[PDB]
């Protein structure tokens, strides 16, 4: 068999990410789902694609769907891209060399936001797993990790080394210490999820998800304690929807500053911040007014912190967008006018251009100056198509019909059309006709560039498919409205011959090579043959559970293929209607299958997002394509079989061309290490009159006990025997500097004791034979500290146990019954007494 | 007196007498708290075609 | 749902809920759009036979047929508030305590974690502290605080001194609590305070054991007398 891969791929302006702007209205970078794709917004074509590389489809190429980027950053000054994935993976991109410099991998999850510090060496990095993890470029390592946001991370605002401010999906905002990496304060922001954050100076701003906004004073320097976020006050924006998005801009030349809300909805609102004075003008000004209206000085003072927010912030203008907005990005700022660039789910980018002058601008309505739309389509492509000369591809889709150069990649026409379900070349590669959802049948002429005939009443109801026959004279057309038409091509207009009614709603119709057999797909789970020449019935295809979505006839017409929603390709025999195979091919529903020209090899599309080339005599897949990110609507197979196109949800057309230590003996070790430390100190002190310690970070003391806590107590017996004498002096001398630290003494008292009296107890003949003076006074030292430590454990316990005897016994005498019989008192006392209950043989 | 399961649900309480409020518990001690739970219990047409 | 008969029923918040009424008593209050039992409110012990609304059901008043009238109202947006603000003080009471324990302020984390019922951080706060008193019982701020206690606070923490108590491990920052309160408390309030008797019954037999213990490890120290004695000769 030969291997396909993916030839290339078009189609898509803008994925699910973010847009950054670079100034040259200058160029735009947005992701096309895997890749990323450089634009030039005044003549509207694609500057460059960056793509690591590993086509879909080769053998060293991964058995998984591409993870989309997900967050796209750029350090202006010093030209590096990164690029950030779903998969938690961040790709440092050179845009001069175009190609990727450093790999980070340290997240779980999709990358929700990126920022570089003002010096470009170090990245910051926010991902659904709730994780902010401090890259270093320049050490191509992750330097820390904040671990303390319960949800995605929303934004982040980090123009310091020393602070840090997040917030999360969890509706929290927490200020971080980059020199501690902890959190010192927590705020809830919003009853719900918090989504935007925008700091300016002492500003800041963020929404919630209702029309809410909150202003907080970020006094850094407080420490308080608490204050470093104070609520300064709250302004409704007139969207009702969530806030995804803030950024600031100030002009130089008026230091005036300017930001927006983008929103989920179609609509972007920009602010302007009033300067101090216009603060003051307008508060004297409102007092007068207030004053006017006899409210008393009270009542003002506390009306002006209602209407704090008011002061500060004056709604400057709504951008409204016939598309919902995906992301925002502020391009240039200057006095004579502002502008805006946007990137919409419909896969367009849009540039806004706001003239103003002072307070307020000067148009009612922002001015839309460019647009790049012509080569991707709005909505997704329901249908494709290859001319005869295998150079032209025919995409359908809802209100657009598309025509592209597979050489060149770039779209030749486009056409306006209503819901467009079916299309198909005519022959010559010269004529297109669609299918639409409101029964009319389009007809288009490529030369003429413009729609020649509409029939609006083709059918009542949706036509759900159309084919051809060979010689390309007549047209068969099956709708949702129980009927099968044939149509005549005549000099060029249609004319209706004939009408087949069927019982049930028809989802597909195909027309054999050799035109002598017709297959049609009912509602009802069956698959109907029809001879063509005579539409005399000939078989009936049974055994589907789900609806059949798509039928093809092999070149032979010998063989037809029945893929269905029940996730099952059926291969049978139109001999005689036989069965041969069912696959469970696709984990979800299958659209399109495709058999490739003069061969029974055949190919399959679902929903799942992956494509699937088959065998058609062997009935194994021969090979998987993950490429795509969201449903496989159509497919398409050359006339002669070099290529296969592809065209699915996420707005891409692809086209695939044909190609140890044991206990004892680590205490021996431990005491060898602190105790050559202890002597070096001692020696050097007096005179005066290592590395393992400081990787740990621990005192020789507190390393050999540790080490003693280690071993399990069923072992530790046994390991102490092992110690030769001379050990037994440095455990000794051990225990003699543990005990000037009272705080590790009384930690660990009875360990100390269990292992002390046990060496003693062990090697005693030795011990008092030796005639060492200083080893006399280690031993009273040791004696003296050791009683006086178990005796002060010893009095505590003494006395609580008597106080508390006291405590139950006055309680008796208060609360207790009395009985002076002492028979009637005993009885008393077995009832009141506690009873448990054993099992006994 | 045997220390036994905590008597406030937030709260859980081990034989050992180490109890941990779930609030202050981190999510990974939660996690594994959680597993050693696992461990002792084990041991006792417009629709369809668009 | 209703076990008796359904006398009355009325929409309520548009058209997102239903109340109904019936002879058992019981007003339930279900979503339309899912057919299912929201709430039920349980005010009456006879048939009810009718039922008003006003503001959307904001205010419900239904009577029964003995005469009596439950004059129902909807708090739920009462309630949130409270939630809100309750977890507002919480978030902030949990970072307060993060930061005196970093900063070894354990004289004000002991005040939040019995607050806040942190039986893990109140153990470190106490162990941590009575490790710098090695180096009356605590210190003289901490001490002061754990004589304010009232006796709420005191029987919360002396389930965990009883709790504590029962490991061997654990049992010596039990008892510098137990002896923290005694020596700061008037004895005579400790024995009236409910149920702090059944908790010092607890303590007791536990206590003895530690004593019994201990005790021997004196007794096994004095094998340094015999090897100092040893060496003498």
Known sequence: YQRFEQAAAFGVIASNANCVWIPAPGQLITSALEDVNIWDIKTGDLVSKLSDGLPPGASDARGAKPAECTYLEAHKDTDLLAVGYADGVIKVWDLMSKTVLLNFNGHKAAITLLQFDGTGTRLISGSKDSNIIVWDLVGEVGLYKLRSHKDSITGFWCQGEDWLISTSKDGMIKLWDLKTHQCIETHIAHTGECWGLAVKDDLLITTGTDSQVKIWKLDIENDKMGGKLTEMGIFEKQSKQRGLKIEFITNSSDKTSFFYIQNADKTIETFRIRKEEEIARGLKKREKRLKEKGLTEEEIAKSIKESYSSFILHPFQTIRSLYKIKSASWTTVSSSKLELVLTTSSNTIEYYSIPYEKRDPTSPAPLKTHTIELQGQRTDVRSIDISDDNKLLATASNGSLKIWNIKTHKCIRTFECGYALTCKFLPGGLLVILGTRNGELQLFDLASSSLLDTIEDAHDAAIWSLDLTSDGKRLVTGSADKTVKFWDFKVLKLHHDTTLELTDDILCVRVSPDDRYLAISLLDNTVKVFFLDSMKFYLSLYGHKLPVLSIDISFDSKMIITSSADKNIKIWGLDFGDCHKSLFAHQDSIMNVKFLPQSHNFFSCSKDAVVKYWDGEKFECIQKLYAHQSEVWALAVATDGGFVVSSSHDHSIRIWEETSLKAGERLMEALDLGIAEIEGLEAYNRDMKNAVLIAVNKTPEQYIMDTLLRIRMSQLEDALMVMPFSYVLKFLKFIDTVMQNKTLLHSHLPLICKNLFFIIKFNHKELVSQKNEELKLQINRVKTELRSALKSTEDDLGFNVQGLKFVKQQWNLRHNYEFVDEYDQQEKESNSARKRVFGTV | ?50 | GHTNAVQRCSFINKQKQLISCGADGLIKIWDCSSGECLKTLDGHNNRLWALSTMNDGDMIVSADADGVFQFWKDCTEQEIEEEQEKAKLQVEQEQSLQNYMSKGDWTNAFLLAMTLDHPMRLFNVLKRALGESRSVIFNEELDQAISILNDEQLILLMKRCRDWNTNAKTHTIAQRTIRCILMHHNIAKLSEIPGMVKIVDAIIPYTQRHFTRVDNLVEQSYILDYALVEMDK
Not at chain 2, 2 to 21: F, P, Q, T, Y
Not at chain 2, 26 to 47: F, G, P, Q, V
Request: charged content about 45%; overall charge positive; glycine content about 6%.
């Open chain 2, 1 to 50: 007196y045997n220390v036994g399961k905590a008597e406030k649900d937030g709260e859980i309480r081990l034989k050992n007498g180490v109890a941990m409020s779930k609030e202050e518990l981190t999510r990974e001690d939660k996690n594994r708290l959680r597993r050693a739970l696992k461990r002792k219990r084990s041991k006792a047409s417009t629709n369809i075609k668009l």
